């Protein structure tokens, strides 16, 4: 009755997934968060 042109619009268009190869350097925390993890260690080690 309603036709084969309409019932194709009854099924939904599904999304196939792809891969999402990123590189992902390790996630840098924020600096105010980085000093709750490590307390008063600032300016003590020589970085060289």
């Amino acid at each position: 009755v309603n036709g084969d042109n309409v019932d194709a619009n009854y099924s939904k268009v599904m999304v196939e997934p792809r891969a999402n190869m990123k590189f992902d350097f390790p996630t840098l925390k924020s600096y105010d968060e980085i000093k709750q993890i490590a307390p008063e260690l600032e300016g003590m080690l020589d970085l060289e």
């Binding site: 009755v1 309603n2 036709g3 084969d4």
Partner: protein, 85 residues
Amino acid sequence: FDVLTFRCESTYKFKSANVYSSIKTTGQVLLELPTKEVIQVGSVDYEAGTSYGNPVTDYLSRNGKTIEESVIFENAIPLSSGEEL
């Protein structure tokens, strides 16, 4: 009932080239008894507007065979040959 023959008639009205504006499909359904008496079991009463096909015939197109009377031979035989005709 074991088997049913649907002897049916249709009345179409159009709205475009292959859409229908209205369909009226009536008909009689038939049962063959073992004593060869044919008694009607019921009726068809279909009526719709703005359709794209007839449901009654499309149901019978797949779920049953047509009562075929024009039985065609495997190889057709010519009656007369030459120039006679």
